[PDB]
Amino acid sequence: PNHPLWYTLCDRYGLYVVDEANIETHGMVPMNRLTDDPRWLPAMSERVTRMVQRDRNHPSVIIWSLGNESGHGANHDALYRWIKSVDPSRPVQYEGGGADTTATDIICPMYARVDEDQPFPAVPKWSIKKWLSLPGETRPLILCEYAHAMGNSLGGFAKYWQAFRQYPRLQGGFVWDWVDQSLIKYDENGNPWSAYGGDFGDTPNDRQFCM
Amino acid sequence: PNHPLWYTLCDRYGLYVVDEANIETHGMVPMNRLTDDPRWLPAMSERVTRMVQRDRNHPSVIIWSLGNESGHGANHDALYRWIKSVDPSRPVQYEGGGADTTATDIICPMYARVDEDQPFPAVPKWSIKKWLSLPGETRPLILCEYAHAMGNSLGGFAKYWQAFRQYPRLQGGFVWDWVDQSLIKYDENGNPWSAYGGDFGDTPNDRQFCM
Numbered sequence: 001p002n003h004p005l006w007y008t009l010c011d012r013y014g015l016y017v018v019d020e021a022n023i024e025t026h027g028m029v030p031m032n033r034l035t036d037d038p039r040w041l042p043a044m045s046e047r048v049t050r051m052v053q054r055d056r057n058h059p060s061v062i063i064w065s066l067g068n069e070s071g072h073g074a075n076h077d078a079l080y081r082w083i084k085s086v087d088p089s090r091p092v093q094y095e096g097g098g099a100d101t102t103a104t105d106i107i108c109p110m111y112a113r114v115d116e117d118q119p120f121p122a123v124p125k126w127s128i129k130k131w132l133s134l135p136g137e138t139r140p141l142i143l144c145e146y147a148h149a150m151g152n153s154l155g156g157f158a159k160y161w162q163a164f165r166q167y168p169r170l171q172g173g174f175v176w177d178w179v180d181q182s183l184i185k186y187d188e189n190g191n192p193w194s195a196y197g198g199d200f201g202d203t204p205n206d207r208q209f210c211m
Numbered sequence: 212p213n214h215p216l217w218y219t220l221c222d223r224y225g226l227y228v229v230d231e232a233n234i235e236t237h238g239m240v241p242m243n244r245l246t247d248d249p250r251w252l253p254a255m256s257e258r259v260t261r262m263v264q265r266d267r268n269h270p271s272v273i274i275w276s277l278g279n280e281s282g283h284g285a286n287h288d289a290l291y292r293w294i295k296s297v298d299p300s301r302p303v304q305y306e307g308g309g310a311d312t313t314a315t316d317i318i319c320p321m322y323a324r325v326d327e328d329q330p331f332p333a334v335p336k337w338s339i340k341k342w343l344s345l346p347g348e349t350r351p352l353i354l355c356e357y358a359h360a361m362g363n364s365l366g367g368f369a370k371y372w373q374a375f376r377q378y379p380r381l382q383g384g385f386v387w388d389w390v391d392q393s394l395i396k397y398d399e400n401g402n403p404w405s406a407y408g409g410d411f412g413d414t415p416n417d418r419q420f421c422m
């Protein structure tokens with residue numbers, strides 16, 4: 001959840017917002033180790049419930065998200081249902097556990113490609129065109145993350161947009177991402193420069209992946 | 212419906228058969244002028260019911276077809292339901308009226324392309340990939356006709372098969388078609404030559420379109 005003024009500004013200038021609970025357990029092995037554990041349900045519930053309690057009156061918020069990269073666990077299903085029960089006015093989405101679980105109203109993959117399947121074990125990233133028409137599938141598809149804009153990037157961006165326009169149920173996506181997470185450091189002469197992972201003695205680090 | 216030996220040969224050699232009622236009113240304006248008319252229901256009914264009565268014991272017959280290129284009329288819906296009642300063991304398909312009407316268990320377009328939409332008024336031929344995922348659409352898609360093999364043709368055949376293999380609900384199609392409908396004529400020396408439309412003084416005719 002963002003600074004409260006953000007939602008007010010989105011209300012007034014006009015931007016659709018996905019409000020997302022402060023839950024990410026990416027580093028766990030497997031990714032759902034905590035989110036499938038009922039002992040972590042209380043901590044998780046608070047991050048979801050208190051977000052909804054705060055932001056539910058903002059028109060800009062159109063979709064609730066259960067967090068990010070925390071696999072798929074029983075705690076997600078419980079909290080998905082909690083939100084649907086308390087606020088039926090907004091769809092709930094969540095990408096974890098393969099982007100099309102029982103904890104999401106929207107197929108919301110990250111970095112699924114337009115035409116190319118990436119058939120990973122358990123959590124495949126289908127071609128977005130293909131994903132829509134899998135046997136039994138009826139949900140809209142909106143990429144929670146796509147077109148990773150790291151450095152000299154966004155090659156093939158046009159391919160996504162051609163598909164979005166051609167396919168009714170391909171309803172767009174959210175580019176990753178808005179702003180380089182660089183930090184200003186100063187050299188011996190007091191001149192500013194842009195720093196990334198590792199430049200503060202931080203180790204282990206993931207270098208330029210923050211930009 | 213074919214010569215009765217055909218189904219016995221398909222039973223024994225092993226080919227899947229779509230058995231199709233002898234009903235085509237292609238030249239009507241509009242195409243459903245007769246098939247929407249209750250006065251033509253008795254005539255149409257006999258072409259459907261007597262085919263089913265003749266051929267229902269052949270295992271090679273896996274799908275019933277209501278005919279071809281006759282638009283979509285109320286008579287089709289009635290006969291669709293008749294078959295579903297008397298023989299629940301086989302799906303019923305029919306392409307007329309846009310290939311995805313209420314008279315068909317299978318989206319069965321003719322000459323719908325793999326990636327390119329042809330948005331004709333009333334009876335669009337969507338890209339087959341796009342067609343599967345149209346809002347609310349759940350049926351399998353099998354082209355009743357595709358890859359028109361007229362003369363030097365079948366360009367882009369691989370594009371269909373790549374799509375068929377990638378998309379579970381794209382379950383193939385029937386190439387148009389098996390054999391050239393050329394006829395034998397003889398020159399002054401008794402030498403045979405292949406003839407097409409118009410070669411018999413027949414007019415109006417559609418020339419080489421029979422091949």
Ligand code: NA
Pocket residue numbers: 163164165166167168169170171172
């Ligand atoms: Na779309």
Ligand code: NA
Pocket residue numbers: 209210211
């Ligand atoms: Na990053």
Ligand code: NA
Pocket residue numbers: 374375376377378379380381382383
């Ligand atoms: Na297929």
Ligand code: NA
Pocket residue numbers: 420421422
């Ligand atoms: Na022809």
